[PDB]
């Protein structure tokens, strides 16, 4: 009768606690709500996007405010290499005096947290210097979030609600997002870099009160409009330049040096400015491709129809894909998440090797935390992309309009795809595990010379093709007579070769047999997770065991014990099973990154080169060895600032085991137990006076799987984050 | 077929009590009542757990769920060869005859029975969910 | 259902008017206000001895590795 | 040298590992009488280690930083004996096994009770099938070219789309 | 007659059948006017439920 | 810190009072029959 | 330099207004 | 002997015999040709 | 409660009716099979969703199909 799940009549009429759980867990599945129209669906999605933007901007404004109010941003800027950043103050009434004095770091007057997000380095690089600058930024972002909230409320009003056709205008949206959202934003950012960040890094102080007075270049906009742009690169910064100080500074605003700043071990600000200018030009050009209102452009549908091979190997090609993609929000979500996961992996892989922020390479814990953060985010995003592809096939795929096109051909030979993924996973797993066990047994028997150590010569050849002279292949920028070397020796190679031939940084680290084995483990993880996800996506509509799986939806428990048993037969269950494998794969990736960088930072890379070829080395020289300071955070003899990370380590272990509980015992035990407890409560005096309204029931099968998965993932993340931070900050090395 | 009425003078089986029985649901929502005729005093197993002696004649047993009524009735039919019928009883005194709606057990085909839920096509000839997008109906409902 | 339990109960009826026959209006609002204000006052006016977080650090900073502070 | 790896003959780490292992074995040996069986076992260990290291040196293995032979699997002619030659031997053996298994399955699908033939293997039939694996690649190519190797997609069970 | 001859080898065209693109032997065909799936097919291999026989209409069976 | 008392004020609220009000309101809302 | 109490209260008022707008948007999403 | 030969031809007995023979062959090969990482040719 | 559907592939073996623990299915006259009967589900409001009727159907794919949903009081099998 219009209870809490007002969007679902069936849940509202459920007299159990299942109503509450499923109303909480099915709120954002707008397409499943009762009396849902596509117009209302699109408008609700638009307003929810506005709300998310407001939330993101509030989060960043709160970061700014807390750093401005409780941080040491000015003290850190005066002395970055010997000041620990402060995240925020701590007011825990449960602390004792030893905890109060253990957490007083960073020159604070009380317990504080030490930031590991890199916001200090990032804000110092972009020109922010004082706490008033950060406060102004926080207030501005509060205003921006308020504006987005106002917009989200406004476009839901009757006279400003957009129509469905407006939401399906793909060409105009692409044009505007490529030109303005991507291109003009990058143009504005390079304008900031030219006007504020670079002068700040060269000792000048440019703010709003002198933006029109401060001259970014002595020859302002003359050579720009005369075509002689080289004037903006005549006087680059010297190698004796000190960041933020006029000593050794130059006058060029758009250089092309490449490599790293010698004192900050980061990319040059002028190189990044020229980067953003170039990509802004490219994006603004690219955003003029499609046809909106002026008779010029492209018709994306006609592009898709035109692209069909005449030989018929692809069938009808891409005919009907425009309508399939524009009519299905799940296809768009899957594509967006795929691209976003790839780009997040790219960000993680490029910021550790090419640090863009000053004094960020020296902050080892910050680098490790950032890498692990973005890699886990990327993995989750990829799982989401595949899950939404499965949801597209179940709910949005029409075989009538998609007849013999590429999607239908994928569905046709899906058995071949899944079988070849199975073969690749099996081969990789068998041989990598066998080599690891061989090495383990050889070290166990005292004969390390009998190991199967395969040199990663392909990646080393690529490194040599990038300018690495350590392996002596002498080709493609490793040789003086190569045409690529001659072409590049004038522009970036003086910096790039110097940076890549420096082994003190993380630019193309030296690799060996352990690197070979772990990259093959990574390939195994990627291939197996993709196998599970693609199998779920392509068997989502049906299979031999359940030919009518599409009528049962995306997430259903099972089809009963008939036909041999049908546990985890849904595509949602494929996602459930692939979350474990992605967690494992990102765990391997981060374990490798972290160990490689611990042995690099400490200066003893021989430990990794000798111990990473067998798994006992991984257990002992990485996990057991680096957890000594972690587990001593609090002990019978006292406690220190790592006590919080020890407590979180144990906390993550506990949540992991509780996830095990929800994943092993399935439903019936708890339903019978709850029956018994209901009897007990109804028969107990002084307590049968208190009565429940929702009949207590055991958790459902899908809900049990999801709760166990959430516990497992939370324990995974917290345990590894605690270990990572404690072992990288207990020894700053 | 005229459904029988639920007599209130039918003795219950000899049972010593159990923790598996009627609860607050029986007094706020509904319960069930199964009746059967027995030729002799014999021991049967209660569906809620335990043993009881059925009367040599009419019997009357209160249950909390329909599934327990079917379990006891199936055991009675396949073991003691006893005809049974049960009713759904509401707190307001409403009694609904349930199991032999037409006097004949559902396993035997009987004339006058209407086909409910019967689809005139193969299971694999269902419409795709995509064609029924934004329509508040299911593929199997067509 | 014996009705003769207490004899002197005029005081208890007299003193309890804010809670009885109020439900969501008076009792709930009073409880929210008198919990928020009470805990705020206690946390703002607690002395150093009773509460360690407000006592503040007393020893010198322990200082971290690699000379970072 | 093929990724900055020195040959193990003039690798100082390889010789250091030789010396360390021999010294450890001799230290274990000092606590036993010369005529005792444990002494004979340890001396056999020492001889085994010496011959192992001499064999590793004589085949031009590439030792990295410290003494550890590293395998080159890029197809270099100087290292064909590490992966290409044993790899081909493996391919011959694995293809043998699979081919003869496939042949046995073919030869028992025409039987009246194939499942009994799978749980109870026809040893004479199986053995005369196994004998045919000597020339397995030729048979595989012949079946591929004739079209008897791959089943047509029209006769293979597939799930609904 | 209705469908294939008795004992003939027939291939299944039902997409939802466990024996799609598989060969079976016809056991019996019912000539009663009104039966929708009169052809009885025996198969050499069982399905997941353990059943090795099914009923099909003549239009979803082809001669080898 | 400019206002040291301000954490001692806010943390108790968002820690105890805000959850109390939020959970009370949500419990009243999800138990409505309408 | 360190922020003042006037700045703190300005931030608090701005957050209160943003909360009002958030509640408004939530009520608009509800129905 | 027909039944005994049939039992000995069962999957587990034949697997035991074949894998034991293979293990003995490999063990003896390693006895006479041990600790080889490179195929000499 | 749950939705139970019967298809024309049914052969009137009655095995789904005998396996039902809550008496949801029953056999009705029909003329599409040799048995001259077909299953039907007139009282699905009593269905719990066990799919025991599905396990008892001998057709290649099931002539009786249970789709679940709603999860009312009778569906959850609650005695309290
Ligand atoms: C120039 C015109 C223009 C502009 C500026 C925008 C801008 C926007 N639109 Mg679009 N829109 C337009 C025209 C335009 N629109 C037209 C003409 C239509 C149809 C007629 C639409 C239809 C439309 C819909 C239907 C939706 C939007 C949405 C949005 C907003 C989402 C932005 C977002 O989340 O990602 C912005 C992300 C970036 C800018 C980052 C891109 C950078 C890439 C990844 C490269 C990597 C750089 C890296 C991040 C930099 C590192 C930074 C680090 C230091 C922190 C955004 C503000 C969505 C929304 O949220 O609405 C509220 C939405 O749902 N628009
Ligand atoms: C769960 C999501 C999540 C979270 C919590 C984080 C958290 C973090 N990221 Mg990551 N990131 C994520 C997802 C996430 N990331 C994904 C999916 C991507 C891929 C696109 C990235 C890519 C990424 C990069 C490339 C970088 C980070 C950085 C950071 C850190 C700084 C905080 C931040 O982003 O500033 C929050 C900032 C904002 C919300 C403001 C962004 C808005 C920009 C400035 C818009 C510019 C357009 C402008 C308005 C146009 C002008 C208009 C007109 C004048 C022309 C922090 C550790 C940075 C870092 O590590 O620095 C130390 C960094 O460099 N992230
Ligand atoms: C959207 C980004 C953006 C914006 C808003 C501005 C805005 C401005 N720039 Mg900047 N600038 C930018 C990008 C941007 N620029 C980039 C990408 C470059 C590199 C080519 C420059 C290089 C540049 C120079 C070299 C000069 C300006 C100048 C100016 C001012 C021009 C005033 C006038 O017309 O006289 C104005 C404040 C001029 C100025 O400040 O005059 C006082 C000036 O001398 N700009
Ligand atoms: C742009 C990003 C994006 C968007 C817009 C959506 C939108 C949607 N998704 Mg997708 N999804 C995404 C990313 C996204 N998702 C990613 C990254 C993943 C991989 C993890 C998934 C995986 C996924 C699955 C598997 C499913 C959806 C579903 C849905 C729909 C309903 C979601 C719902 O009920 O919300 C309600 C929100 C929840 C139930 C989440 C509750 C909180 C979770 C469990 C995390 C809590 C962790 C922990 C307890 C909190 C921290 C504790 C602390 C102590 C550490 C909706 C259309 C569902 C759907 O379409 O149904 C057919 C569906 O089945 N999504
Ligand atoms: C260490 C734990 C572990 C291991 C070894 C495996 C191994 C495997 N999983 Mg599993 N899995 C695990 C944990 C594990 N999983 C967990 C925690 C989850 C989350 C629920 C999953 C979820 C999962 C899914 C969803 C899928 C897999 C798949 C796979 C296969 C991937 C291919 C591969 O590696 O082939 C190499 C094979 C192995 C590493 C297996 C071990 C081989 C042993 C060592 C050789 C035999 C030794 C010896 C002779 C036996 C002695 C016993 C006795 C005779 C005396 C493989 C069989 C995928 C699959 O089957 O695709 C083909 C797949 O779809 N797994
Ligand atoms: C999302 C951003 C964010 C986050 C996570 C935090 C986190 C914290 N703040 Mg800060 N704060 C923020 C923004 C944020 N703040 C902003 C924008 C302001 C300006 C008004 C402040 C002003 C502020 C003060 C004055 C104090 C804190 C304090 C605290 C701590 C205790 C919690 C508390 O009392 O909150 C109080 C928070 C507010 C009054 C700000 C309003 C809430 C903001 C706007 C976020 C709300 C929306 C956000 C998206 C959450 C959505 C909920 C959920 C869906 C995730 C905690 C570390 C206390 C502290 O330092 O203790 C040591 C303290 O005394 N905050
Ligand atoms: C990005 C985050 C995000 C966004 C944009 C939304 C958006 C939405 N959710 Mg989802 N949700 C989220 C996170 C999010 N939710 C999380 C983390 C959970 C917990 C798992 C839920 C659980 C959930 C449920 C169970 C339901 C929704 C509903 C809704 C809709 C809002 C209607 C409603 O009841 O508002 C709730 C909020 C308000 C009505 C007003 C309060 C707004 C915020 C939360 C607080 C504002 C500040 C507050 C007053 C304190 C400040 C004090 C002072 C300054 C004033 C809308 C589509 C409902 C719906 O109709 O779905 C279709 C619904 O039933 N959501
Ligand atoms: C089935 C696999 C198999 C194979 C191919 C071999 C092969 C061999 N074994 Mg046997 N052996 C095996 C299993 C196997 N062994 C098992 C399981 C055991 C343990 C019971 C032994 C115990 C064993 C001993 C004790 C000896 C051999 C010896 C030999 C070698 C010399 C044969 C000889 O002199 O005639 C052997 C037959 C007769 C004398 C009759 C030969 C290479 C001999 C050797 O290495 O000589 C130096 C030797 O002395 N083997
Ligand atoms: C897939 C992973 C893998 C791989 C590639 C290897 C590979 C190897 N291991 Mg390792 N090992 C593994 C897993 C693996 N092992 C695991 C999981 C364990 C734990 C149980 C071990 C434990 C282990 C130990 C303890 C030892 C090895 C040894 C060896 C080596 C030789 C073994 C041997 O019998 O060669 C001898 C050669 C043969 C048996 C040749 C095959 C003979 C057949 C019958 C073919 C006959 C010829 C054919 C018909 C004609 C071909 C053409 C002709 C021209 C040649 C070899 C480098 C040994 C070694 O020497 O270390 C370096 C050793 O001592 N391994
Ligand atoms: C299921 C599905 C889905 C999803 C899916 C996915 C998620 C996918 C993914 C995918 C992916 C994730 C992909 C990736 C890719 C990649 C690539 C393709 C790459 C390429 C590269 C290149 C080409 C390179 C080049 C180069 C280099 C090498 C370096 C230097 C420079 C240059 C540029 C030259 C959807 C929803 C759609 C729908 C349905 C189906
Ligand atoms: S549905 Fe299946 S089990 Fe039930 S009568 Fe029809 S064929 Fe028999």
UniProtKB/Swiss-Prot annotation, chain A:
Specify which residues bind chlorophyll a B1 according to the UniProt entry for this protein: 653
Residues that bind phylloquinone, according to the entry?
670
Gene Ontology terms for molecular function: 4 iron, 4 sulfur cluster binding; chlorophyll binding; electron transfer activity; magnesium ion binding; oxidoreductase activity
**GO CC terms:** chloroplast thylakoid membrane; photosystem I
Residues reported in the UniProt entry to bind chlorophyll a B3:
661, 669
EC number in record: 1.97.1.12
Q: Which InterPro entries match?
A: PSI_PsaA/B, PSI_PsaA/B_CS, PSI_PsaA/B_sf, PSI_PsaB
Q: How is the cofactor bound?
A: P700 is a chlorophyll a/chlorophyll a' dimer, A0 is one or more chlorophyll a, A1 is one or both phylloquinones and FX is a shared 4Fe-4S iron-sulfur center.
Keyword Cell membrane listed: no
For membrane topology, the record states: Multi-pass membrane protein
Keyword Cell division applies? no
Q: What class of enzyme is it?
A: oxidoreductase
**Which controlled-vocabulary keywords does the entry list?**
4Fe-4S, Chlorophyll, Chloroplast, Chromophore, Electron transport, Iron, Iron-sulfur, Magnesium, Membrane, Metal-binding, Oxidoreductase, Photosynthesis, Photosystem I, Plastid, Thylakoid, Transmembrane, Transmembrane helix, Transport
Function, as annotated, reads: PsaA and PsaB bind P700, the primary electron donor of photosystem I (PSI), as well as the electron acceptors A0, A1 and FX. PSI is a plastocyanin-ferredoxin oxidoreductase, converting photonic excitation into a charge separation, which transfers an electron from the donor P700 chlorophyll pair to the spectroscopically characterized acceptors A0, A1, FX, FA and FB in turn. Oxidized P700 is reduced on the lumenal side of the thylakoid membrane by plastocyanin.
> What NCBIfam families does its record include?
psaB
| Assembly information from the UniProt record | The PsaA/B heterodimer binds the P700 chlorophyll special pair and subsequent electron acceptors. PSI consists of a core antenna complex that captures photons, and an electron transfer chain that converts photonic excitation into a charge separation. The eukaryotic PSI reaction center is composed of at least 11 subunits.
- Homology family: Belongs to the PsaA/PsaB family.
Task: Kindly provide the name given to this protein in its UniProt entry.
Answer: Photosystem I P700 chlorophyll a apoprotein A2
Swiss-Prot record, chain H:
User: Mainly resides where?
Assistant: plastid
Origin superkingdom: Eukaryota
Instruction: State the UniProt keywords alphabetically.
Output: Chloroplast, Membrane, Photosynthesis, Photosystem I, Plastid, Thylakoid, Transmembrane, Transmembrane helix
**Segments traversing the membrane:** 7-27
Biological role: May help in the organization of the PsaE and PsaF subunits.
Q: Which Gene3D superfamilies match?
A: Single helix bin (1.20.5.510)
Which cellular compartments is it found in?
Answer: Plastid, Chloroplast thylakoid membrane
Q: What is this protein called?
A: Photosystem I reaction center subunit IX
A Gene Ontology biological process noted in the UniProt record is: photosynthesis
> What GO CC terms are in its UniProt record?
chloroplast thylakoid membrane; photosystem I
This protein's species is Physcomitrium patens
Does the record's keyword annotation contain Aminoacyl-tRNA synthetase?
no
In the bilayer, the protein is annotated as:
Single-pass membrane protein
Family note: Belongs to the PsaJ family.
Q: Does the record carry Coiled coil as a key word?
A: no
From Swiss-Prot, chain I:
Q: Where is the 4Fe-4S ferredoxin-type domain?
A: 1-30, 38-67
Compartments in which it is found: Plastid, Chloroplast thylakoid membrane
Sites binding [4Fe-4S] cluster 2 sit at 20, 47, 50, 53
User: Sorted alphabetically, which keywords does the UniProt record give?
Assistant: 4Fe-4S, Chloroplast, Electron transport, Iron, Iron-sulfur, Membrane, Metal-binding, Oxidoreductase, Photosynthesis, Photosystem I, Plastid, Repeat, Thylakoid, Transport
Instruction: Cite the cofactor comment.
Output: Binds 2 [4Fe-4S] clusters. Cluster 2 is most probably the spectroscopically characterized electron acceptor FA and cluster 1 is most probably FB.
Q: What is its main location?
A: plastid
What cofactor does this chain's UniProt record say it requires? [4Fe-4S] cluster
Q: Determine if Transport is one of this entry's keywords.
A: yes
Q: Which PROSITE patterns match?
A: 4FE4S_FER_1 (PS00198), 4FE4S_FER_2 (PS51379)
- Pfam families linked: Fer4_7 (PF12838)
Q: Name one GO biological process term.
A: photosynthesis
Q: How does it sit in the membrane?
A: Peripheral membrane protein
What reaction gets catalysed by this protein? reduced [plastocyanin] + hnu + oxidized [2Fe-2S]-[ferredoxin] = oxidized [plastocyanin] + reduced [2Fe-2S]-[ferredoxin]
Q: What name has this protein been given in UniProt?
A: Photosystem I iron-sulfur center
The species this protein belongs to is Physcomitrium patens (Spreading-leaved earth moss)
């Amino acid at each position: 009768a219009s209870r809490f799940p007002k969007f679902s009549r069936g849940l509202s009429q459920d007299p159990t606690t299942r109503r509450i759980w499923f109303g909480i867990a099915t709120a954002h599945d707008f397409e499943s709500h009762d009396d849902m129209t596509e117009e209302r669906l699109y408008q609700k999605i638009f307003a929810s996007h506005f709300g998310q933007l407001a939330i993101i901007f509030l989060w960043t404004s709160g970061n700014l405010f807390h750093v401005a109010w409780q941080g040491n941003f000015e003290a850190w800027g005066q002395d970055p290499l010997h000041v620990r950043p402060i995240a925020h103050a701590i007011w825990d009434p449960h602390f004792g005096q030893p905890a109060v004095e253990a957490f007083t770091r960073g020159g604070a007057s009380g317990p504080v947290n030490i930031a590991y997000s890199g916001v200090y380095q990032w804000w110092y690089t972009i020109g922010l210097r004082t706490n008033q600058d950060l406060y102004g930024g926080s207030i501005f972002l509060l205003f921006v979030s308020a504006l987005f909230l106002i917009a989200g409320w406004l476009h839901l009003q009757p006279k400003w609600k957009p129509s469905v056709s407006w939401f399906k205008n793909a060409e105009s949206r692409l044009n505007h997002h490529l030109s303005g959202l991507f291109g003009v934003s990058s143009l504005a950012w390079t304008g900031h870099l030219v006007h504020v960040a670079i002068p700040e890094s060269r000792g000048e102080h440019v703010r709003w009160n002198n933006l029109l007075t401060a001259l970014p270049h002595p020859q302002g906009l003359g050579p720009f409009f005369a075509g002689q742009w080289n004037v903006y690169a005549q006087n680059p910064d010297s190698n004796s330049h000190l960041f933020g100080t006029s000593e050794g500074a130059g006058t060029a605003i758009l250089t092309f040096l490449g490599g790293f700043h010698p004192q900050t071990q980061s990319l040059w600000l002028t190189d990044m400015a020229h980067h953003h200018l170039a990509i802004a030009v490219i994006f603004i050009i690219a955003g003029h491709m499609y046809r909106t209102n002026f008779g010029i452009g492209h018709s994306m549908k006609e592009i898709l129809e035109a692209h069909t091979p005449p030989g018929g190997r692809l069938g009808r090609g891409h005919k009907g894909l425009y309508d399939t993609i524009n009519n299905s929000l799940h296809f768009q979500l899957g594509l967006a998440l795929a691209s976003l996961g790839v780009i997040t992996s790219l960000v993680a892989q490029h910021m550790y090797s090419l640090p863009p922020y000053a004094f960020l390479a020296q902050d080892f814990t910050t680098q490790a935390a950032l890498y692990t953060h973005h890699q886990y985010i990327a993995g989750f995003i990829m799982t989401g992309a595949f899950a939404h592809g499965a949801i597209f096939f179940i709910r949005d795929y029409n075989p009538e309009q998609n007849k013999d096109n590429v999607l239908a051909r994928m569905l046709e030979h899906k058995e071949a795809i899944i079988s070849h993924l199975s073969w690749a996973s099996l081969f990789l797993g068998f041989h990598t595990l066998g080599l690891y066990v061989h090495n383990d047994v050889m070290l166990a028997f005292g004969t390390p010379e009998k190991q199967i150590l395969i040199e990663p010569v392909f990646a080393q050849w690529i490194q040599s093709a990038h300018g690495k002279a350590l392996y002596g292949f002498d080709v493609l920028l490793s040789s003086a007579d190569s045409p690529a070397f001659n072409a590049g020796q004038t522009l970036w190679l003086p910096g790039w070769l110097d940076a890549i031939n420096n082994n003190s940084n993380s630019l193309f680290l030296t690799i060996g047999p352990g690197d070979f084995l772990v990259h093959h483990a990574i390939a195994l993880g990627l291939h197996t997770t993709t196998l599970i996800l693609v199998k779920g996506a392509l068997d989502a509509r049906g299979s031999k065991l359940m030919p009518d799986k599409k009528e049962f939806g995306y997430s259903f428990p099972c089809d009963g014990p008939g036909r041999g048993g049908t546990c985890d037969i849904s595509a949602w269950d494929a996602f459930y099973l692939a979350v474990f494998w992605m967690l494992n794969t990102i765990g391997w990736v981060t374990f490798y990154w972290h160990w490689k960088h611990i042995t690099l930072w400490q200066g003893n890379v021989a430990q990794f080169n000798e111990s990473s070829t067998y798994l006992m080395g991984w257990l002992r020289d990485y996990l057991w060895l680096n957890s000594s300071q972690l587990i001593n955070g609090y002990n019978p003899f006292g406690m220190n600032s790592l006590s919080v990370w020890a407590w979180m380590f144990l906390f993550g272990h506990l949540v992991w085991a509780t996830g095990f509980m929800f994943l092993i015992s399935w439903r019936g035990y708890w339903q019978e137990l709850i029956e018994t407890l209901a009897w007990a409560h109804e028969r107990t005096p002084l307590a049968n006076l208190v009565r429940w309204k929702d009949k207590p029931v055991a958790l459902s099968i899908v809900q049990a799987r999801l709760v166990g998965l959430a516990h497992f993932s939370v324990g995974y993340i917290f345990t590894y984050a605690a270990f990572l931070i404690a072992s990288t900050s207990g020894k700053f090395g | 077929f005229t459904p029988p009425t639920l007599n209130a003078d039918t003795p219950a089986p000899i049972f010593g009590g159990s923790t598996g029985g009627l609860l607050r649901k029986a007094q706020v929502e509904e319960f069930y009542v199964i009746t059967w005729e027995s030729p002799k005093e014999q021991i049967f197993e209660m569906p809620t757990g335990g043993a009881a002696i059925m009367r040599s004649g009419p019997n009357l047993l209160k249950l909390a769920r329909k599934e327990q009524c079917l379990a006891l009735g199936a055991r009675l039919r396949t073991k003691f060869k006893i005809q049974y019928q049960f009713y759904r009883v509401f707190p307001n005194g409403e009694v609904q005859y349930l199991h032999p709606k037409d006097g004949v057990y559902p396993e035997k085909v009987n004339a006058g029975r209407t086909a409910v839920g019967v689809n005139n096509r193969s299971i694999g000839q269902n419409a795709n969910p995509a064609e029924l997008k934004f329509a508040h109906k299911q593929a199997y409902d067509l | 259902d014996d009705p003769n339990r207490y004899n002197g109960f005029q005081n208890k009826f007299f003193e309890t008017f804010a809670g009885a026959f109020t439900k969501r209006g008076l009792l709930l609002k009073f409880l929210v206000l008198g919990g928020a204000t009470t805990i705020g006052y206690l946390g703002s006016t607690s002395s150093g001895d009773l509460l360690a977080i407000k006592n503040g650090p007393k020893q010198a900073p322990i200082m971290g590795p690699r000379g970072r502070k | 040298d093929v990724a900055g790896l020195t040959p193990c003959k003039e690798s100082k780490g390889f010789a250091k590992r030789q010396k360390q292992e021999i010294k450890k074995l001799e230290g274990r040996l000092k606590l036993y009488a010369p005529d005792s069986a444990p002494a004979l076992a340890i001396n056999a260990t020492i001889e085994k280690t010496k011959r192992r290291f001499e064999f590793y040196g004589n085949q031009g293995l590439l030792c990295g930083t410290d003494g550890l032979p590293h395998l080159i699997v890029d197809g270099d002619q100087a290292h064909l004996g590490e992966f290409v030659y044993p790899g081909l031997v493996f391919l011959y053996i694995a293809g043998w096994i699979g081919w003869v298994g496939r042949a046995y399955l073919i030869d028992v699908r025409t039987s009246k009770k194939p499942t009994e033939k799978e749980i109870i293997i026809d040893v004479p039939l199986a053995l005369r099938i196994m004998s045919k694996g000597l020339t397995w690649p030729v048979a595989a190519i012949g079946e591929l070219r004739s079209g008897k190797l791959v089943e047509k997609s029209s006769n293979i069970t597939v799930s609904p789309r | 007659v209705i469908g294939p001859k008795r004992g003939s080898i027939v291939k299944v065209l039902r997409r939802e059948s466990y024996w799609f693109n598989d060969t079976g032997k016809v056991v019996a065909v019912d000539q009663a006017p009104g039966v929708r799936y009169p052809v009885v097919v025996r198969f050499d291999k069982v399905n997941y439920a353990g059943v090795s026989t099914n009923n099909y209409s003549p239009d979803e069976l082809e001669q080898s | 810190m400019t206002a040291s008392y301000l954490p001692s004020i806010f943390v108790p609220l968002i820690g105890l009072v805000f959850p109390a009000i939020t959970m009370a309101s949500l419990f009243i809302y999800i138990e409505q029959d309408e | 330099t360190s922020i003042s109490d006037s700045q703190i209260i300005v931030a608090l008022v701005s957050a209160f207004i943003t909360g009002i707008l958030a509640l408004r948007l939530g009520k608009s999403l509800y129905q | 002997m027909q039944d005994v030969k049939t039992y000995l031809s069962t999957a587990p007995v034949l697997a035991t015999l074949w894998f034991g023979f293979l293990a003995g062959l490999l063990i003896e090969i390693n006895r006479f040709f041990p600790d080889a990482l490179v195929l000499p040719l | 409660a749950h939705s139970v559907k019967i298809y024309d592939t049914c052969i009137g073996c009655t095995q789904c009716v005998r396996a039902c623990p809550t008496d949801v299915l029953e056999m009705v006259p029909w003329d599409g099979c040799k048995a001259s009967q077909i299953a039907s589900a007139p009282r699905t409001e009593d269905c719990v969703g066990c799919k025991r009727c599905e396990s008892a159907c001998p057709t290649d794919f099931l002539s009786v199909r249970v789709y679940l949903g709603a999860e009312t009081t009778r569906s959850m099998g609650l005695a309290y």
